[PDB]
Amino acid sequence: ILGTGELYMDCVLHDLRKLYADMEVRVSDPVVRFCETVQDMSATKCYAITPNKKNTITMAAEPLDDGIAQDIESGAVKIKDPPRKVAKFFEEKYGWDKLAARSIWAFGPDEMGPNILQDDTLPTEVDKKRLATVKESIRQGFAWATREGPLCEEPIRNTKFRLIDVSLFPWWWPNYSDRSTCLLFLFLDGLPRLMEPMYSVSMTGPQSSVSMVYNILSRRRGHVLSDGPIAGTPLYRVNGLIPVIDSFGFETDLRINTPGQAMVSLVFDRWSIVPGDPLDREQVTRPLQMATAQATARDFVLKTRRRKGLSEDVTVAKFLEPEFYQSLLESGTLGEP
Amino acid sequence: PYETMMYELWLRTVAASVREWDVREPEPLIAVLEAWDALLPGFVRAQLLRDVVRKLEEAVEKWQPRKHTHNLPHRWIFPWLPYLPASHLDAKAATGLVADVRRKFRTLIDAWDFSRGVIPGLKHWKQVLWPEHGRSSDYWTPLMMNH
């Protein structure tokens, strides 16, 4: 069950136990819905060959620039807008090439999703009609694959794809998991990161209360964005930022610790990068124990995987063709398994 | 009592100044820290260092390595280099200002064309991220040779 906050889920679970289901329900500790992203562009132009060895797909991935995901989520551009207007918007706002901006194919996972797919392919090497049929296949295959993501099967944000040349597309393809698989390994080569939701904190209260807010946010890995008086009142309003997973219990702790009376609002603000690298095999977290500042992403992704029932580690061999897997293992682009 | 009053008032004022001031010119903030560091308690100093490290990491993450080359990250992080924490300054760390700088340098090296020239600030970034002793802890040579 996914909901907005502590009071929201308290009301929901009350209505589940007493109002609708009318029984006793075991309820877990609360956790957050994660997201995925990349921070470095793809170094190896990754390719995939069909099970019948007819078609081949070659591409790379890249982090998006700041503001594209928020503008596409708000609705500055649409996948149903005219392509000339879409290209004009990207070229004007983000300094984008006209060819690339016209070559933007896909918004994923949905029409207003935060991932984009563009072909850098050359018409001199790719015939457009076969490119059109396999393009619709890539539309829906990329849409299928971008809900999951490789790290913890949580949807991926802030991603650009560039379909590179040489990839040839003969007729007919009924399988989807293959270019899903090369998108996943392309993420691994893009060296992904995990993203957590952020609450904007906003409290109102006296000055002893603002001092206690600074203290409690310091313990709970948040920070104070702004801090001011409210004109005409003896009140002070303090805005800040905190993760949801660290804000569980934040309101109750603040209200029972402040000597005045502080009133707290926790709203969803944005997705931010969780500290740590999710693929660092060195970082180990003890059971029952607080994650360190460096092992936090690793701890989150392992426990998400074990909660969902996935394998204990990311499987590059499962996420690759054996030939290209062995070739990249020989080349040393990937680490030791 | 004086220590806690100084903590509350002075650390709140220093955090407000750190939030208001520009990241690219840390000389006045460093001068304020050097002047008031005699009476500054350890808790207030740690909180102010955390705020400065957060501002520097935010600037390093937001600044485009290929495009926004006007504000040099090395020159921006030079003023707070001696007061930076070990966890942030550790290049081997997964998260930190030094880790973000190394990742940005690796990304710029991977997506850098020969026509644009060398990456600005990469020399001081490699000087910061190059360990004096230890082959396994040197994150400068391997990332450079791989990117």
Binding site: - | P1, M5, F43, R45, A46
Partner: peptide, 28 residues
């Protein structure tokens, strides 16, 4: 210094300032 600053036990709980008139009255 940073460990004692960031330590939730080591970050001390605060209390308010004194009264100078009360201190002078106590001395008198």
């Amino acid at each position: 210094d940073l460990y004692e600053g960031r330590g939730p036990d080591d970050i001390p709980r605060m209390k308010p300032l004194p009264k100078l008139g009360d201190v002078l009255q106590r001395i008198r």
